[PDB]
Design a protein around this ligand. Structure first.
Ligand code: PLP
Ligand code: PLP
Lengths: 454, 454
């Protein structure tokens, strides 16, 4: 089948996530056919550097033949059985045991789902059920942040702070509130990042008192905001958020769907930033994207509460799916046993962060060069001196994104932020290869900008 | 590694869907280890007849080594790439094209998810977006039915009509309404099923008029209610429902997550009952549960509307997952090319239905014996003549279900309804084997019932 034929059928039959279907079909979709290591190939034979690891998720890289064997094997002995009928199976039990070993102490119990979005919905129902069991039926409001992302279920879309999502579905649903994000470049004023972190955290206390603590169930946040543009909060932020949650008896929830499983060099983002959530949600890197699986890790306090509540009338047919569990188990064992997470912390992470800042810090319209471990970013700005952003935030980002895409480099544009999260197994030489291409693209971007009078 | 050790680890680490964790952990979970055809084996070596096909989903049966090979091949080539970045891949394109061939005309476009619950959330958001595009922002209420089931996301749980789900999470969310279910045994009074079908359908009309039609976006229903107990509506019901929807310009949605992919003998439940929905939701049988995947099949009218609205800000990371799509393609090809669906319609379906009715007709406390294709059921009753149900609906069903499991037969109890949906590939010999066990179990049930208080 040819490229044109694949594009024709896709256009005729397939509706994509977060896309303008009419526009995509007119332009024709790029057809990705093969993956190896940190590279992809499309139907036209182009070799491509995947600086986004699929979608923040292919942490061990492409080409894991042993994962495929594990999946083949499980699918042959027991492709599926449910966990609804007072029933279980070996794959899900073994995964549960292994996860308990790589997660912080006090996270022994896990609830499985198919996606990060379902994980978030599960977490929402869990935190509300918890307060009901505690004898506090009014404590039901969850607080998230503007520009935070927590998936695409009705629940996750509501808890998320993307107005372009809220506007489709009559969202958010009741019992959801939002505070501003800890984006220093925009909101920092004449504060240092550290003093801004305290101020941005205290926005949470302001909202809790506005609503009434007796009505607030939880605060939920990504340790680093992903889809929002890799917004890295100041070091003072999460400790203050935690102090506030504790003061007002509000549950603290980390959404680890992106930061989870080695992304920051720690196993989980909350470990890097030094707070202790009562639950956290996961997916993506849990299986390195090799098969769909998500999870909610429930701390002991919330677990006991749920357990005391009897029946928990929640779950999905494919919860604990044997094949996905078998692959996830192989992935997590690899991340640990092959020293992949440790390598991010000790070796490739520090190297990436150094080289990232050496590469982009010299560009006239790049600023806020940032990142940790193997997630990094910067922002395209009109004038660094005034911290002035381009109008129509996102239009310039698209231009630069298309230049990357044309040059067979995948880095994503989130508004005018450029972000990257490559496979964790990326070599130092691969890191340098990617940056050399990225640098060339920014030079092309800089000239294209000046040449358009922008 | 022994039964005991898996049960200790499951208790210690695993939170299951729809169960009392405290009780299960005390009693011990049943460990399912392997499957072949229509049979399962547990860690204790018991051979089990799976009369529920996993969870209404293992439609081609266990042991498809060809599906495992399709999975392996795809996972080695491209285990994942996203469909977000103006990108696609051959597996999802191929599946989309095959699906268009087995779905009714006018359904050419499909949106992928990981589960039936995500499909329902997707459908809710599409339905509301569609009406926004029409310039009718108040046309946002979706109507479902009491005892309907549409998943376990916050959205799906709210649209579903299970009170016990509503009472956990503060559901339903706004813009949801419910009408009574077309359960003739309970609500039929002195009407014929056909007369009742019209009355029960008209409950939708009176609800629309109570709310106001300009505020009603859609009616959503399972052609046959699954988790509610295989409630089979009279022949007159769906045509009247459809007539009412057209009268009030209300979208009609079939939830085919169970009835889909051959369960009734047609490819889809709505084909059997002769109505034409504007969208329908799928999962389960889409891949015979071999991997998690779901879909929304979008008809031409709504597709046109979504497409006219530019960005559709919705979707999941693993939407259209290559490996899952490759396995679903294999499954759908098998259902068609191996004549499995046709065989349900022409051979095993009629046989099952005849034998089901022959088997359970004689029992004193069994009534409303029903079914179509390879979904069938009956209800345990205190007195047939009065159509008097036992009090504490569900307690007596539990008694009977337990007898089944002690005799290595899986049939589910939904309240006091006993239900069955075995793999579609079940042979006539296997049907008779299953019914011989079940008949024995019902004889024991009548015994104990009479022995300890009818
Ligand atoms: C991607 C993502 C989700 C949702 O995961 P899906 O698998 O796409 O449903 C939730 N939270 C965060 C932080 C994410 O990055
Ligand atoms: C099982 C089911 C769902 C939900 O599917 P999951 O894959 O469990 O999320 C939705 N609708 C119907 C009719 C179902 O039977």
């Amino acid at each position: 089948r040819t490229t044109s034929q694949w594009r024709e059928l896709d256009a005729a039959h397939h509706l994509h996530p977060f896309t303008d279907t009419a526009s995509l079909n007119q332009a024709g979709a790029r057809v990705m056919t093969r993956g190896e290591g940190v590279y992809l190939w499309d139907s036209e034979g182009n070799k491509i550097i995947d600086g986004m690891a699929g979608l923040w998720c292919v942490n061990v890289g492409y080409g894991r033949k042993d994962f495929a064997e594990a999946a083949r094997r499980q699918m042959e002995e027991l492709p599926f059985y449910n966990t609804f009928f007072k029933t279980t199976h070996p794959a899900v039990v073994e995964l549960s045991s292994l996860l308990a070993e790589v997660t912080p102490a006090g996270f022994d119990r896990v609830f499985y789902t198919n996606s990060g979005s379902e994980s978030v919905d599960t977490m929402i129902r869990m935190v509300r059920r918890y307060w009901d069991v505690q004898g506090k039926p009014e404590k039901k409001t969850l607080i998230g942040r503007w520009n935070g992302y927590h998936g695409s279920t009705i629940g996750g879309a509501s808890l998320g702070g993307m107005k372009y999502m809220h506007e489709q579905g009559d969202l958010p649903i009741p019992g959801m509130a939002h505070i501003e994000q800890p984006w220093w470049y925009k909101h920092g004023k004449d504060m240092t990042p550290d003093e801004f972190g305290v101020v941005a955290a205290r926005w949470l206390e302001e909202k809790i008192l506005e609503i009434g603590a007796d009505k607030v169930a939880a605060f939920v946040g990504e340790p680093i905001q992903g889809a929002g543009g890799v917004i890295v909060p100041p070091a003072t932020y999460w400790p203050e958020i935690e102090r506030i949650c504790r003061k007002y008896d509000v549950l603290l929830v980390a959404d680890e769907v992106i930061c989870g499983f080695g992304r920051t060099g720690e196993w989980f983002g909350h470990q890097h930033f030094g707070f202790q959530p009562d639950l956290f949600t996961a997916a993506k890197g849990l299986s390195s994207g090799y098969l769909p699986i998500g999870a909610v890790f429930v701390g002991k306090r919330v677990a006991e509460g749920l357990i005391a509540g009897g029946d928990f009338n929640h779950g999905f047919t494919y919860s604990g799916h044997p094949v996905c569990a078998a692959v996830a188990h192989a992935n997590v064992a690899a991340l640990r046993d092959e020293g992949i997470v440790q390598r991010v912390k000790d070796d490739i992470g520090p190297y990436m962060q150094k080289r990232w800042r050496e590469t982009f810090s010299r560009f006239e319209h790049v600023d806020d060069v940032r990142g940790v471990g193997m997630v990094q970013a910067f922002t395209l700005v009109k004038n660094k001196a005034k911290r002035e952003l381009f109008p129509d935030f996102g239009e310039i980002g698209t231009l630069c994104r298309d230049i990357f895409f044309r040059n067979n480099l995948i880095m994503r544009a989130c508004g005018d932020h450029i972000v990257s999260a490559p496979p964790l197994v990326m070599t130092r030489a691969e890191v340098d290869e990617m940056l050399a291409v990225a640098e060339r693209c920014l030079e092309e971007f800089e000239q294209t900008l000046k040449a358009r009078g922008l």
